[PDB]
Write a protein that binds this ligand. Structure first.
Ligand SMILES: CCCCCCCCCCCCCCCCCC(=O)OC[C@H](COP(=O)([O-])OCC(O)COP(=O)([O-])OC[C@@H](COC(=O)CCCCCCCCCCCCCCCCC)OC(=O)CCCCCCCCCCCCCCCCC)OC(=O)CCCCCCCCCCCCCCCCC
Ligand SMILES: CCCCCCCCCCCCCCCCCC(=O)OC[C@H](COP(=O)([O-])OCC[N+](C)(C)C)OC(=O)CCCCCCCCCCCCCCCCC
Ligand SMILES: CCCCCCCCCCCCCCCCCC(=O)OC[C@H](COP(=O)(O)OCCN)OC(=O)CCCCCCCCCCCCCCCCC
Ligand SMILES: CCCCCCCCCCCCO[C@@H]1O[C@H](CO)[C@@H](O[C@H]2O[C@H](CO)[C@@H](O)[C@H](O)[C@H]2O)[C@H](O)[C@H]1O
Ligand SMILES: CCCCCCCCCCCCO[C@@H]1O[C@H](CO)[C@@H](O[C@H]2O[C@H](CO)[C@@H](O)[C@H](O)[C@H]2O)[C@H](O)[C@H]1O
Ligand SMILES: CCCCCCCCCCCCO[C@@H]1O[C@H](CO)[C@@H](O[C@H]2O[C@H](CO)[C@@H](O)[C@H](O)[C@H]2O)[C@H](O)[C@H]1O
Lengths: 98, 86, 459, 171, 172, 52, 63
C-alpha cells in the first residue's frame, strides 16, 4: 500500500449555486462565461455568419455561368449553329500522330 | 375511471363472495378464514382469487394469491396495488 | 493566412496573461471571434482557388475544413472546463495551450500549398494530440492508447515522407498548384506500385481504413472529451483531405490499386456497423460508428468522380459535427454516472427531457435523415458508387439499414425504458451542456439551407 | 419582360372562353373576384410603394465579359503561365456548358408539363434538341474524372479524332 | 423447482381455467366446461401416493400444452398485456425533487414542508434499521429475501423508504 | 487600458497585424499586375495600378 | 431546461430581429441593382458585378 489521499466526493454545482449555469463556481464568473458563449456563439457567429453566408456574392460564379449560358444559347440558335459542339478544341489547332 | 375506496373495494369483495354457492352469506365476514372458518379447500381458494381478478380487471400472481386467505387480506392487497388510501 | 495564424497564436498570451478565474471566459470568447472571421475564407471563385502567397492557399476543399476546425476550438473549451475544474492552474493553461497549438497546426495543414509543408504540420498534430490523451485521460489504458495512436500513424507517415521527397526529386516541385500542370501519368511497375502505397497508406491509417482502424477505438475510449472531439471531427479528416489532394498524381494507377481498398471499405463498413449493435461501451460505439462512416469517404475518394468528391466533402463536414456532438452527449452522461457502460443508465428521457431531444437530433443526423447534410453526403457517394458498379447498392443498402438499427438502439437503450433505480445523481442539465449541444446541431442543420459551401471544389 | 422569350420559349397561350351550360352560379368565378379584391389589390399597392423607392435609387450591375485567351492546344509543354490561363478558361467554359444543358433540360421539362397527355408528340423538338446537346456534352466532358483538366479533355478529343479518322479510312 | 407439489397443481389449475376461458368466450359455455374441468381435479384430490400424484401432474401438464390457446386472454396491465408498462414513462423517482429550483419549490410550500418531515423521518430511522438487520441476520448472511418487521414502538420496518415512497401506479 | 481589459486587445491586434502582413505579401507578387492575357488593359487617367 | 431555451431565444433574437429589420429596410429603400450593359470604355469595379446591395457590400469590404 502507501500513504494516499482518498477519492474526493462529487461536487454538485447546484448545491451552492442553484442558479448555476455549469460554467464556474463563482456566480459572477459563471454568468459572464454564459454571456460570452451565447452572445458570441449565437448572436454573432450563428446569426451574423448565417446572414453573411446567405448574401455571399455569387459563390463560385454559378449565377454568372447561368447568365452566360443564356447569352450563348440565344446567339447560337438565332444564327443556326449547334447549341454545343462535340469538340471542345478547334480541330485545326491539333496535329494527330501518324 | 371512477376512483376506488377502501369501503368500495370491501363491498365488492364481499359482494362476489355472497354469489359463491359454497359460502354462507350470513356467516361471511371480512375476517373469515376461507378454510378455518368457511371450510373451503385450496381449489376453491384459487377460484375465489380468479373471481376477484375478473371483478377488478387485474391479475394477482399465484405467489401473491396463495396468501390471501380472508376477505380483509384481499381488500388490503387490492388497495395496495391501486394506491387506495382513503 | 496570417490573419488567422497570428490571432490563433495570440490566444496563447491571452490564456497565460488572463486572471486566474477568467482563463475559460477569455479563451472561449476570443476563439469565437476568430471563428467568426474565418467566414472570410468563403471568397471562392469558379475557376481559380484563393492563393494568398507562396506558402498558403485556400480552395473550396480546405475552406470548410478550416471553418470546422476554428469552430471546434471554442466548443472544446466549453466541453473541458468542467472536468478540469480541480486541475492546477498552470496545468489548466497548459491544457488550453495544447488545444490552441493543435488549431494552429491544423489551419496551416489545410492551407499549405507545398506537400512537404503539409507533411510536417500533418505530423506535428500528433504531439499535442498524444499529450492530451496520455496526460489528461482518466484510465490506465490511456498510455497504451497513446502508443497505438503514435506508432500506427508513424508506420504510415515515414513511407509517405520518402515518397514525397522522391516525387520532388523527379518532378522538381511539390507545390500543389505546380503539380496540377506538371503531373505526368503513372505507368504500371512494381516501383510505382510501392510509390502508390507509400503515398496512400499514411492517409488510410488516419481515416481509418478498415483493418488498420484498431488504434481508433482505443484512443477514443481513453481520450478526454476535448481530445475525442478534435480526433473525430478534424484529425480523421486529415486522412481524407490528404487523399483528395495526392490522388492527382497517382493516375491512372489508381484504377487498379484502389480495388483492395474499396473491398476493405465496402465490406468493412458493414462489419463496423454490425459491431456497433453489440458494443457495451457508449464511446466505443461512437468510435466504431466513425469507422463505418469514413469507409464511405475512402470509397468515394478512390472512385474519383465529380459526384463522389462532392459527396466525400459533405460527409467529412457532416460527420465532423455529428460525431463530435455524440461524444459530447455521451460525456454529459459520464460526468454524472462516471461510467461509459451503455446499459448502466437507462430511461434518461424521463429525468433529462431536453437532453433527450439532443440525443434524438444527434441520432437522426447519424442515420442520415434527409435533407440533413449527413444524407446529402451519403447519398451523393451512393449515386457515384452505383455507376462504378451497380452491385454496390446491395452493400450500401445493408449499411443504411444497420446504421439505423444501432443509431436508434443507442437512443432507445440510454433514453427510453425505465430509469435505473439506484442511480440518483442525475442532476438537471446545465446551461453549458445544453449550449454545447445546440452549438453542434444548429450549424449542422443550418447548412442544409445552403449546402453548396460544403460540397468542395467540384461543385 | 423579365427573361428572354428566345432562351425560354413559351408557345402562344390559347384559353377557351367560358361556356356555362348550367344555371347555377360558378363558385370559382366569385372566389376569383374575392381573391383580386382581398389579396391582389392590397398586395399590388404594397408593391407599387416599393417600386417607387427603388426608382429613386437606380443603380446598375454588369455581367462580366471574359476575353478569350489561347486554349491548351497553343500552350508549350510545362509552360505553367500559359497553361494556367488556358486551364482557367477551359474551367469557365465547363461551367457554362453545364448551364447550357440545364437550360435545354428546363425547356424539356416545361414542355412535358405544358402539353399534358399530348407531351409524347408535342415535345419532339425539345427531346431532339436535348438528345443532341447531351451527346455533345458527353463527348466533351464525360469520363474525365474528379481531377479533370484541359489536358485530359484534349487527350480525350485526340483519341476520339483518331478513331473517327480510322473508320473514315475504312471507307 | 422450489414450488411444492401443491403449488404446481394449483398453478396448473388456474392456468388451465384461463386458457379454457379463452376457448369458450361465452360465459355460460365457460361455466359448463370449467365445472367438468374442476370435476377432473376433484377426481384425484385424495390420491395419497406421491409417485402416482406426480405422474398425474406430468400428464396433466402434457395435456395442457396440447390444448393451450395459442392466443390466450391477458389482463391489459399484466405482463404481456396491451397496457403493460404503459405508464413507466410517467413514473419519476422522488429524489428528482431535491434538484428543483427554489422558485419551483415556492409554488408548493405545503407539499415541500411535509416532504422535509419524511426526509427527516428517514434520516432518524436509518441507523436503527441497519442495526436491526445486523442483530437478526445469522453469520453467513441472510438465506431468504424476507425482511423483519419493526419490533418496538417508534421503529420503522427496516428498508421501507423505496416501498413507501414508490411512484403511484397512475402518476400523471 | 483598464487593469481588467488590456488582455482583450491581443487577439484583435493579432488579426489586424496578420491582415496587414497578408496585404504586404501581395506587394511582392505584382510581377503580372495588368499583364495577364485575360485582364490586361489600359490604365484609367488617374489610376496608377489596377490593384494594390 | 426552460431557462436555457429562453436564453437561447433571447440571444438569437438579440441580433436576429435587428438583422431582419435591417434587411427589410435595405430591400425596400435601397433595393437591387439593375442589369446593364458595360458602357464603352468603362471599367466596372469588381463589386459592381453583383446585384444585391449586401452582396455588393461584402465584395467591396472584404474580398
Ligand atoms: C434561418 C436561416 C436564416 C439565414 C439568414 C436569412 C437570409 C435572408 O435574409 O434571406 C431571406 C430572403 C431575403 O431575400 P433578398 O435577397 O434579401 O430579396 C431581394 C429582393 O430584391 C427582394 O425583393 P423585394 O424588395 O420585393 O422584397 C423585400 C421585402 C422585404 O422582405 C424581407 O426583407 C424579409 C426578410 C426576412 C428575414 C429572413 C429571416 O419587402 C417587403 O416587405 C414585402 C412585404 C410583402 C407583404 C405583403 O427573404 C426570404 O426568403 C424570407 C422568406 C420569404 C417568404 C417565404 C416565401 C413563401 C413560402 C413559400 C415556400 C413554402 C411553400 C409552402 C410549403 C410549406 C412547407 C410544407
Ligand atoms: C416554411 C416551411 C418550413 C421550412 C423549414 C424551416 C427552414 C427554412 C427557414 C429559413 C428561411 C430563410 C432561408 O432559407 O434563406 C436562407 C438562405 C438560403 O436561401 P438562399 O440561398 O436563396 O439565400 C437567400 C438570399 N439571397 C436571395 C440573396 C440569395 O441562406 C442560408 O441558408 C444561410 C446559411 C446558413 C449556413 C451557415 C452556417 C453558419 C456558419 C457558422 C460557422 C460555424 C458553423 C460550423 C462549421 C461548419 C463548416 C462549414
Ligand atoms: C517497412 C519497414 C521494414 C521493411 C523495410 C522497408 C523498405 C523496403 C520497402 C521496399 C519498397 C520498394 C521500393 O523501395 O521501391 C524502390 C524504388 C526504386 O526505384 P528507382 O530506381 O529509384 O526509380 C527508377 C525505377 N527503375 O523506389 C521508387 O521507384 C519510388 C518509390 C517511392 C518511395 C516508396 C517508399 C517505399 C514504401 C514502402 C512502404 C509502403 C507500404 C507502407 C505500409 C504501411 C502500413 C501501415
Ligand atoms: C473586438 C474584441 C472584443 C473582445 C470582447 C471580450 C469579452 C470578454 C468579456 C469579459 C468581461 C468581464 O469583465 C469583468 O468586469 C469586472 C469589472 O471590471 C472585473 O472585476 C470583477 O471581478 C468579479 C468577477 O469575478 C466581480 O464579482 C467584481 O464585482 C469585479 O471586481 C472582472 O474581473 C472582469 O472579468
Ligand atoms: C494492399 C496491397 C495491394 C497490392 C496490389 C497489387 C497490384 C499488382 C500489380 C501487378 C502489375 C505490376 O505491373 C507490371 O510490373 C512489371 C514489372 O516487372 C512490368 O513488366 C516488366 O517486368 C516483367 C517481368 O515480370 C517483364 O515481363 C516485362 O517485359 C517488363 O516490361 C509490367 O509491364 C507491369 O504491368
Ligand atoms: C441588417 C443586416 C446587415 C447585414 C450586413 C450588411 C451591411 C451592409 C448593408 C448595406 C450595404 C450598403 O448598400 C449600398 O446601397 C447603395 C445605394 O445607394 C449602393 O450604391 C449604389 O447607389 C449609390 C447611390 O446611393 C451610388 O453610389 C451607386 O449607384 C451605387 O454604388 C451600394 O451598392 C450598396 O452597397
Amino acid at each position: 500500500r502507501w500513504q494516499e489521499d482518498p477519492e474526493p466526493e462529487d461536487e454538485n454545482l447546484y448545491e451552492k449555486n442553484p442558479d448555476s449555469h455549469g460554467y464556474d463556481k463563482d456566480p459572477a464568473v459563471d454568468i459572464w462565461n454564459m454571456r460570452v458563449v451565447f452572445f458570441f456563439g449565437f448572436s454573432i457567429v450563428l446569426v451574423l455568419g448565417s446572414t453573411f453566408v446567405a448574401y455571399l456574392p455569387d459563390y463560385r460564379m454559378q449565377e454568372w455561368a447561368r447568365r452566360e449560358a443564356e447569352r450563348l444559347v440565344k446567339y447560337r440558335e438565332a444564327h443556326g449553329l449547334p447549341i454545343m459542339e462535340s469538340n471542345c478544341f478547334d480541330p485545326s489547332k491539333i496535329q494527330l500522330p501518324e | 375511471a371512477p376512483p376506488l375506496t377502501l369501503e368500495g373495494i370491501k363491498d365488492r369483495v364481499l359482494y362476489v363472495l355472497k354469489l359463491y354457492d359454497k359460502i354462507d352469506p350470513e356467516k361471511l365476514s371480512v375476517n373469515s378464514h376461507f378454510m378455518k372458518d368457511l371450510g373451503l379447500d385450496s381449489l376453491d381458494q384459487v377460484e375465489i382469487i380468479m373471481a376477484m381478478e375478473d371483478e377488478f380487471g387485474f391479475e394477482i400472481p399465484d405467489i401473491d394469491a396463495e396468501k390471501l386467505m380472508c376477505p380483509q387480506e384481499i381488500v388490503d392487497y387490492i388497495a395496495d396495488k391501486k394506491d387506495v388510501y382513503e | 493566412m496570417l490573419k488567422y495564424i497570428i490571432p490563433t497564436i495570440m490566444l496563447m498570451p491571452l490564456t497565460w496573461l488572463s486572471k486566474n478565474n477568467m482563463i475559460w471566459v477569455n479563451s472561449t470568447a476570443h476563439s469565437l471571434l476568430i471563428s467568426f472571421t474565418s467566414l472570410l475564407l468563403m471568397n471562392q471563385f469558379g475557376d481559380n482557388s484563393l492563393n494568398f502567397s507562396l506558402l498558403f492557399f485556400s480552395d473550396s476543399l480546405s475552406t470548410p475544413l478550416l471553418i470546422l476546425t476554428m469552430w471546434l476550438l471554442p466548443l472544446m473549451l466549453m466541453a473541458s472546463q468542467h472536468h478540469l475544474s480541480k486541475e492546477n492552474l498552470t496545468r489548466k493553461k497548459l491544457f488550453i495551450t495544447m488545444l490552441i497549438s493543435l488549431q494552429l497546426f491544423l489551419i496551416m495543414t489545410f492551407t499549405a500549398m507545398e506537400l512537404i509543408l503539409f507533411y510536417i504540420l500533418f505530423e506535428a498534430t500528433l504531439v499535442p494530440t498524444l499529450i492530451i490523451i496520455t496526460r489528461w485521460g482518466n484510465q490506465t489504458e490511456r498510455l497504451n492508447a497513446g502508443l497505438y495512436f503514435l506508432f500506427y500513424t508513424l508506420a504510415g507517415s515515414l513511407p509517405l515522407l520518402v515518397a514525397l521527397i522522391y516525387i520532388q526529386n523527379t518532378v522538381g516541385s511539390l507545390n500543389f498548384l505546380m503539380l496540377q500542370y506538371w503531373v505526368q501519368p503513372v505507368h504500371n511497375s512494381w516501383s510505382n506500385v510501392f510509390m502508390w502505397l507509400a503515398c496512400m497508406m499514411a492517409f488510410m491509417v488516419k481515416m481509418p481504413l478498415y483493418g488498420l482502424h484498431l488504434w481508433l477505438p482505443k484512443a477514443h475510449v481513453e481520450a478526454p472529451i476535448a481530445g475525442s472531439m478534435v480526433l473525430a471531427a478534424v484529425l480523421l479528416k486529415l486522412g481524407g483531405y490528404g487523399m483528395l489532394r495526392i490522388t492527382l498524381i497517382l493516375n491512372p494507377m489508381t484504377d487498379f490499386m484502389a480495388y483492395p481498398f474499396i473491398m476493405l471499405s465496402l465490406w468493412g463498413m458493414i462489419m463496423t456497423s454490425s459491431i456497433c449493435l453489440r458494443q457495451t461501451d457508449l464511446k466505443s460505439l461512437i468510435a466504431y460508428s466513425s469507422v463505418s462512416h469514413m469507409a464511405l469517404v475512402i470509397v468515394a475518394i478512390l472512385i474519383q468522380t465529380p459526384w463522389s468528391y462532392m459527396g466525400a466533402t459533405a460527409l467529412m463536414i457532416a460527420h465532423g459535427l455529428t460525431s463530435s456532438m455524440l461524444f459530447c452527449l455521451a460525456n454529459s452522461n459520464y460526468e454524472r454516472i462516471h461510467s461509459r457502460t451503455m446499459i448502466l443508465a437507462r430511461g434518461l428521457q424521463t429525468l433529462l427531457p431536453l437532453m433527450a431531444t439532443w440525443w434524438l437530433l444527434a441520432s437522426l443526423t447519424n442515420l442520415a435523415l434527409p435533407p440533413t447534410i449527413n444524407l446529402i453526403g451519403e447519398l451523393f457517394v451512393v449515386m457515384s458508387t452505383f455507376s462504378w458498379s451497380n452491385i454496390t447498392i446491395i452493400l450500401m443498402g445493408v449499411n443504411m439499414v444497420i446504421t439505423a438499427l444501432y443509431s436508434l438502439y443507442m437512443l432507445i437503450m440510454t433514453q427510453r425504458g425505465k430509469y435505473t433505480y439506484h442511480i440518483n445523481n442525475i442532476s438537471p442539465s446545465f446551461t453549458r451542456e445544453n449550449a454545447l449541444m445546440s452549438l453542434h446541431i444548429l450549424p449542422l442543420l443550418l447548412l442544409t439551407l445552403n449546402p453548396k459551401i460544403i460540397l468542395g471544389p467540384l461543385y | 419582360d423579365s427573361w428572354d422569350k428566345d432562351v425560354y420559349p413559351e408557345p402562344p397561350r390559347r384559353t377557351p372562353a367560358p361556356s356555362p351550360q348550367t344555371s347555377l352560379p360558378n363558385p370559382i368565378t366569385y372566389l376569383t373576384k374575392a381573391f383580386d379584391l382581398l389579396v391582389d389589390r392590397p398586395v399590388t399597392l404594397v408593391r407599387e410603394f416599393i417600386e417607387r423607392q427603388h426608382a429613386k435609387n437606380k443603380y446598375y450591375y454588369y455581367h462580366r465579359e471574359f476575353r478569350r485567351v489561347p486554349d491548351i492546344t497553343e500552350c508549350q509543354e510545362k509552360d505553367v503561365l500559359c497553361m494556367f490561363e488556358a486551364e482557367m478558361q477551359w474551367r469557365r467554359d465547363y461551367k457554362v456548358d453545364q448551364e447550357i444543358v440545364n437550360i435545354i433540360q428546363e425547356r424539356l421539362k416545361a414542355c412535358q408539363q405544358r402539353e399534358g397527355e399530348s407531351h409524347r408528340q408535342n415535345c419532339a423538338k425539345e427531346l431532339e434538341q436535348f438528345t443532341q446537346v447531351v451527346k455533345a456534352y458527353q463527348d466533351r466532358y464525360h469520363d474525365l474524372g474528379a481531377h479533370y483538366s484541359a489536358r485530359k479533355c484534349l487527350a480525350k478529343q485526340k483519341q476520339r479524332m483518331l478513331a473517327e479518322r480510322k473508320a473514315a479510312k475504312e471507307a | 423447482a422450489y414450488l411444492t407439489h401443491q403449488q404446481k397443481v394449483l398453478r396448473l389449475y388456474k392456468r388451465a381455467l384461463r386458457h379454457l376461458e379463452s376457448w369458450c368466450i361465452h360465459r355460460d359455455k365457460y361455466r359448463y366446461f370449467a365445472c367438468l374441468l374442476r370435476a377432473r381435479f376433484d377426481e384425484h384430490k385424495n390420491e395419497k401416493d406421491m409417485v402416482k400424484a406426480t405422474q398425474l401432474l406430468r400428464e396433466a401438464e402434457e395435456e395442457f400444452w396440447h390444448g393451450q390457446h395459442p392466443q390466450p386472454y391477458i389482463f391489459p396491465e399484466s405482463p404481456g398485456g396491451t397496457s403493460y408498462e404503459r405508464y413507466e414513462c410517467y413514473k419519476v423517482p422522488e429524489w428528482c425533487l431535491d434538484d428543483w429550483h427554489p422558485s419551483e419549490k415556492a409554488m408548493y410550500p405545503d407539499y415541500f414542508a411535509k416532504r422535509e418531515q419524511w426526509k427527516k423521518l428517514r434520516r432518524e430511522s436509518w441507523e436503527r434499521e441497519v442495526k436491526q438487520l445486523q442483530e437478526e441476520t445469522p453469520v453467513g448472511g441472510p438465506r431468504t429475501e424476507a425482511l423483519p418487521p419493526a419490533r418496538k414502538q417508534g421503529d420503522l420496518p427496516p428498508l421501507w423508504w423505496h416501498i413507501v415512497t414508490r411512484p403511484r401506479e397512475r402518476p400523471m | 487600458v483598464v487593469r481588467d481589459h488590456w488582455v482583450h486587445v491581443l487577439v484583435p491586434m493579432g488579426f489586424v497585424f496578420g491582415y496587414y502582413l497578408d496585404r504586404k505579401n501581395d506587394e511582392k507578387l505584382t510581377a503580372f499586375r495588368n499583364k495577364s492575357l485575360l485582364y490586361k488593359r489600359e490604365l484609367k487617367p488617374n489610376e496608377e495600378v489596377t490593384w494594390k | 431546461d426552460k431557462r436555457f431555451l429562453k436564453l437561447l431565444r433571447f440571444y438569437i433574437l438579440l441580433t436576429g430581429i435587428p438583422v431582419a429589420i435591417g434587411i427589410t429596410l435595405i430591400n425596400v429603400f435601397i433595393g437591387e441593382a439593375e442589369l446593364a450593359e458595360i458602357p464603352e470604355g468603362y471599367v466596372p469595379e469588381h463589386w459592381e458585378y453583383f446585384k444585391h446591395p449586401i452582396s455588393r457590400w461584402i465584395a467591396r469590404t472584404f474580398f
